[PDB]
Amino acid sequence: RGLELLSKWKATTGNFDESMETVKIALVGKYTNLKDSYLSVIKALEHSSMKCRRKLDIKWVEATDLEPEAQESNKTKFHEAWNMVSTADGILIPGGFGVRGTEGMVLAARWARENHIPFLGVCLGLQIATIEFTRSVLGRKDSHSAEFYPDIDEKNHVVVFMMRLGLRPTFFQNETEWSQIKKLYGDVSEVHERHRHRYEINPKMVDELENNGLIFVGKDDTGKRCEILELKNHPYYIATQYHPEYTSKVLDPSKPFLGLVAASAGILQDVIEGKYDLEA
Amino acid sequence: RGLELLSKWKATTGNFDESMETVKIALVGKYTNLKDSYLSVIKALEHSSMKCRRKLDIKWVEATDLEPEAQESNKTKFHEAWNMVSTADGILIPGGFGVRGTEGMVLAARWARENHIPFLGVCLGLQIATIEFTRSVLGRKDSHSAEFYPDIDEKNHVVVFMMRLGLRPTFFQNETEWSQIKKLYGDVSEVHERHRHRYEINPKMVDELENNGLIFVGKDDTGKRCEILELKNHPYYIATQYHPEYTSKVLDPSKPFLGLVAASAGILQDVIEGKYDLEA
Questions:
Q1: What CA dihedral angle connects B14, B18, B21 and B23, to 10 degrees?
Q2: What is the CA radius of gyration of chain A?
Q3: A85 with B86: Cβ contact below 8 A
Q4: Strands B164-165, B196-197: pairing kind
Q5: Among A25, A201, B3, B78, which lies 20 to 30 A Cα-Cα from B18?
Q6: Is A226 a catalytic residue?
Q7: Which one of the listed residues B47, B52, B62, B123 is annotated catalytic?
Q8: Bridge partners of residue A171, in order along the sequence
Q9: β strands within chain A, DSSP E
Q10: ∠ CA(B75), CA(B76), CA(B82), 5° rounding?
């Protein structure tokens, strides 16, 4: 197992030197200038990009520069932000801190829902995948995070302090054999993942979202908590309430990020079928 | 008047050499590869750009490359099209021929409605400014041009063969003193313009559009026909049912195109106030 780990390291290293073609990903969030604040997300994209043999090019987008208000306030940076979103082969909403970036992150999720761009939402990214699908597929234009507390009736989320932390399981919903993400997990019955959330999607709404096609393909032990979503019949539109970048490893890339790179490369089928494992 | 015409020619010529800064405009339509097919539109943008002292940079966008379907069909050109739309200081829908480009031209009109980008719609561009404002501000997602005849109930337009052609008047609606476009026309009571249309916006709907803020600031002699719209409280969002590029002249630029360049330059107020007339 020592010699095999070296051989597999020489393989992932060779797959970086032997990398012929680029994948461009827009990472859209608060204060992306502070690049160490997203360090795990970058490394999770790197580990997966060496499995796909493709060169990674993260475009850093400040989420607030996408806003319709930014166009009069700071027009130049607003065009740079939108060129990055328009160029990218995939979109990534990375699980930001606090509310500020939300309005632009909605428009980045809309951009990948409508036009078939590959997408991953992490934590606040699932929250914003659900706020957007509510705000555009159900109408409901007033809907917002539970952070906007005094609106009450239109809160898209509910408090669940138990903060939920550490390695907890997540179980696939037993009918979802079509799912792109539960295929990447090798058809295993459950997964185990890290969490950092005080809010979850309001269970009252989840039947409406499931019936409209925002299928919650994974839930917790109780079945009350929204842990994964996949939009039915889109090339790759995933979100996770957990942070999968806290279990990405260089020889075993975290599956939600592997799917984002592989679909951005247009190769997702063949990665699932096994054309890119390190040893035969 | 001979010597004055030469002096005014030396002035507009000097304003091209003395041009310090660029204005970028996306012209979005069918078959923009066939650049002579939009010749008058280009010349109308050139005449106005010399009044603004600013260098013109038309981005040519094939409207069909903006479509959500183009993303799987021909992904590379779809990113080039969206980068142009995202970069531009103004959007222009030029009065295209036939239906093909419509679905992308809707998304270009939406892009300039929501984010405060300057816009001009000419003929089919007013039709698409009204289809978009219907399709996104009123909901009504099934609405379409009268060209999709067998849908009946959701047709956004009505036949009016009288084809309407040649120089006809248009009269401002007597309350619209706020209007950016009727300010560019010098507060004159009426205008005279060229037409080429078989369809007009269905009069049954126009009260709903006026009440929601898509104010039809100009109509015909009867008041039945939709000749101009301006969206209330946007920096510059105009459309014309007429083709104003068929009366643009090098010393007297056509007013709807002067407003598009001047607002793309962020100077619209000062052009209306008179900081750019050729002789004192």
A1: 10
A2: 18
A3: yes
A4: antiparallel
A5: B3
A6: no
A7: B123
A8: A190, A219
A9: 22-29, 55-62, 90-93, 119-122, 157-159, 164-165, 168-172, 190-193, 196-197, 199-201, 214-219, 226-231, 237-240
A10: 85
How far separated are the first and last CA of chain B, in Å rounded?
Answer: 15
Shortest CA distance from B117: residue in chain A: A71
CA–CA distance, A46 with B238 (Å, rounded to integer): 47
- DSSP 8-state class, residue B57: E
Catalytic pick among A67, A123, A197, A230? A123
A82, A115, A139: residue with CB nearest B86: A82
Which residues in A lie closer than 8 A to residue B114 (C-beta atoms)?
A: 68
A115/B68 Cβ within 8 A: yes
**In which element (H, E) is residue B214 found?**
strand B214-219
Closest CA to B172 of B124, B213, B227: B227
B82 touches A at CB < 8 Å: yes
* Among B235, B241, B243, B227, residue whose Cα is nearest residue B190: B227
Paired residues of A91 in beta bridges:
A26, A119
Give how far the C-alpha of residue B157 lies from the chain's centroid of Cα atoms, to the nearest Å: 18
CA-based nearest residue to B84, from B23, B26, B22:
B26
Half-sphere exposure of A121 (CA within 13 A, CB side): 28
Q: What string of H, E and C letters represents the secondary structure of B61-128?
A: EEHHHHCCCHHHHCHHHHHHHHHHHHHCCEEEECCCCCCCCHHHHHHHHHHHHHCCCCEEEECHHHHH
**Within the 246-265 window of chain B, which residues sit less than 8 Å (CB to CB) from chain A?**
none
Angle, vertex CA A65, rays to CA A64 and CA A66, nearest 5 = 90
- B138 CB neighbour count, 10 Å cutoff: 14
Structure tokens at B68: 């959500």
Facing B79 at nearest CB: one of A87, A139, A235: A87
Query: For residue A25, what are its two tokens?
Result: 């990903």
Residue in the block written with tokens 């200038």: A33
Residue B245 annotated to the active site: yes
SS3 of residue B154 by DSSP: coil
The encoded tokens of residue B252 equal: 């007297």
Asked if B68 is an interface residue toward chain A (Cβ–Cβ < 8 A), one would say yes
Residues on chain A touching B71 (C-beta within 8 angstroms): 115-117
Decide if B74 contacts B244 (C-beta within 8 A).
no
Q: Could you give the residue ranges of the DSSP H alpha helices within chain B? A: 2-17, 39-51, 70-73, 75-87, 102-114, 124-137, 180-184, 203-212, 255-264, 268-273
Q: How far is A114 from chain B (nearest CA, A)?
A: 6
